[PDB]
Amino acid sequence: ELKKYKLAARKFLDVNPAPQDIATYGGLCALASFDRSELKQKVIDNINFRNFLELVPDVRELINDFYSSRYASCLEYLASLKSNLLLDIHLHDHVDTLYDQIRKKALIQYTLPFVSVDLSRMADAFKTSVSGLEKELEALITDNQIQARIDSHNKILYARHADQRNATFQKVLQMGNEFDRDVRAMLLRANLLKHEYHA
Template structure:
């Protein structure tokens, strides 16, 4: 029923991959605690990601992935592959469950046969309702054996068989859910747009689930401002009551991380305060990871050293997260630039060496960063190479007065020109009116 090539994990499980990140330094971190609120393929993919990219946690990550896969899927090919990889951490021994593999393959084949028979009956009766039930079962089976792309294709190929608008909406939301498991953010957006086109007013539970998907897709696409705006519309109690967290794909901790990091990357000090720190709704998410609350407060208080230390700690955890991990470098750069803007704001000139010490860097690295920020227009200043100071551009009051005078003069000339054209127009109209009156009198 499944092969390694078809599996959700499949050939991606390469034990020889280079390990990229150390164990997270986040306070009270444990891999079991991190993964406990995820379920099914979401838990499997996250545990596998840890196994691939963190040597200190590799054995535990692969073990958790294997156990969850055995408990909640029919993906025997991925199970065999995980067991093979785990032998590298157990001295060549394996506890592969051959009976489970055999029974699971038989169960999957039996269910596939039943579904095919159900499809045949539906075609003979020309019943769209029965066809949709068989399609739903088949898609669920494909997901259980790890054939996610085939499940999406199956849904796309059967859109015309939907008996009503509601069924079309359910079909598209299922495609969005599978895309969410695969971290395909553009596909999620596309499928959600299709849901809204056929279900303009979806049920509350579906509306909440779609809101979370959109927020996660915005973050995954590096649309930081959009992600923050969407996250601030979420409510912990609504997501809990509508069962969004029960799906085990996105947790309240995830939303706190997305909102904190995207907010620090997208906005300056004042907006971070008004949008995140003072938001009672977002604070309920922050309760799941207090370190984010402390980071936001340190940023607002201009406590640069503490803010950077907390940011490093949080990002060390985010590096093992398959959603945030690919964007850690970009997030750090954006947040660091915002800290630099915040640092230089009160000064007309300042020592680059001193700024580097405060921001846990060295003078050469800080100077390169400042050059880039000046080129991008984020800072209006110049670097004095002789003194090692950053000197901000300040306008001379006389230059400002001269510039304003020139603007007034230009506006006056424009008004004069327009008035001249207006007079000319009225004179021409007067001549034309007089000639028409003479013709009428004749």
């Protein structure tokens, strides 16, 4: 246990009664779990804690760049500090999964605003081959997080939008048939028990 992200970061920040450890972690784990509003409240609107964040200017700059859509710079900074970050027990225990979570968060934040995302730009933006990012996108969409369909001809990520009305009609008609068949199976099962009780 005790391997969560948001609750663990909140507990680590809320220390009842060293200073480098307080400056480190914290918002790094919060960004892996907290959404945009929560991260903004806990970092930008946390001047009491942002005073400690000033002691670590690189971490605050990376957090702002993530908030300011500067994925390349913060990703490069984290990669450079990856060897140093995973050398302080707290991150040494689990660093790869945390970095993976930051990566996935970066992707989902990237594809959220646009409708016609271009995968070629994200390739050099994230410093990954088109095939690798394609496989990552398959993994994400198969989890039903990035609601979109990947066009594999011109490498365009056309966003997917539902129609609701057409989806509702298909779901209701399927429900009725399932209810219809079960009720007919209800009558036959009842009569068999009636026949047995007579004997």
